[model samples]
Target: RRSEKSRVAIVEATRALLLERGFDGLSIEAVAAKAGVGKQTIYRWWPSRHALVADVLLEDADKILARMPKTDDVTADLASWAGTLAAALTTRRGHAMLKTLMAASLEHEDTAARLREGFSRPLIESVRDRLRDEDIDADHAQAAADALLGAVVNAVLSEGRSYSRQRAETSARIIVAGLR
Candidate 1:
């Protein structure tokens, strides 16, 4: 029970630190202090500061991904997914964590890989599954997936809001239409 509580506390501390100071400012000592736990306690559960952040984000990803709508209609599914994703990206906590993640990605190649595996690949897989269920061609599905990922990433990194749910959904349709 204590171990579980410590793990949850560490994750909360990691999230707060990430939002407040970004990745470069995060450290085991900082998280331990913020969590009101000992540094040795954090080290016992996570081998590195990066590992702690990774686990924190991974837990968040799981909750978000699990709640995404599942449907056989590719177009509708993409629309729903795009809108939900855009909302999350623009949220206060989501934007903060995402910006931190982008910064971490630049400094740590391993963290970048972790993000790809933990976030990107699963999103693509969900798209692919929905397309297959809708009987869409594999090529079209792949193109749609690529376009969605590209558009979302650009939107998130842009200086202003260059992409919206309508834009993302239309872009996906255009890409899929071209493939068909």
Candidate 2:
């Protein structure tokens, strides 16, 4: 119980620091101090700061993805799920978190692998599953998933541009048509 409490405190402290200082400003020492735990405790649980951030990212993404809508219409379901994800990325805090994760992935191989496995793989598999339900071939379903994800990434990274439900729906429509 005490260990769980400390773990929760550590995660909460990391989140608060992330909001206040962004990724660049966060440190194990800072988080430990903020959580009122020893630096060793933080290091004991997380091998590195990027690993901790990845945990936080996974938690946040899981929450959003869990809320993704489903329906009998595959296209509509895809649109709803992608649109919700796009909407999250459109937020300033969401954008920051994503950008931070991207940066971490670039800098650390472990972080990249973990992020891909925990976050990207699950989302891609979900899309692929939806496409397969429509009787789309495996290769085509994979391609559709890639295209859908690429569209979201492009929207998020596009300078001076913003993500929109319209964009998400349009991408979903195009991918669905291509699959069929």
What tens-digit string does per-residue lDDT give for candidate 1 at 1-180? 357777788889889988788788888888889988999888777666666777677778853453446665556667677767766766667766667667766766788899778887888898777677667767777877877767776687674343466776676666655545
Question: For every candidate structure, what is the RMSD over all alpha carbons to the true structure, in angstroms?
Answer: 2.9, 2.4
Q: After aligning candidate 2 to the native by TM-score, how far in Å is the CA of 128 from where it should be?
A: 0.7
State which candidate has the highest lDDT.
2
Model 1 residue 160 distance off true place after TM-score fit, in angstroms: 6.0
Sliding window of 10 residues with minimal summed lDDT for model 1: 63-72
Worst 10 residues of 2 by lDDT: 62-71
TM-score of 1: 0.80
Clashing pairs in 1: none
86-143 per-residue lDDT for model 2 (tens digits) = 8777777677767767877887998999888877788898888777777877888888
**CA shift at 142, candidate 2, in angstroms?**
1.3
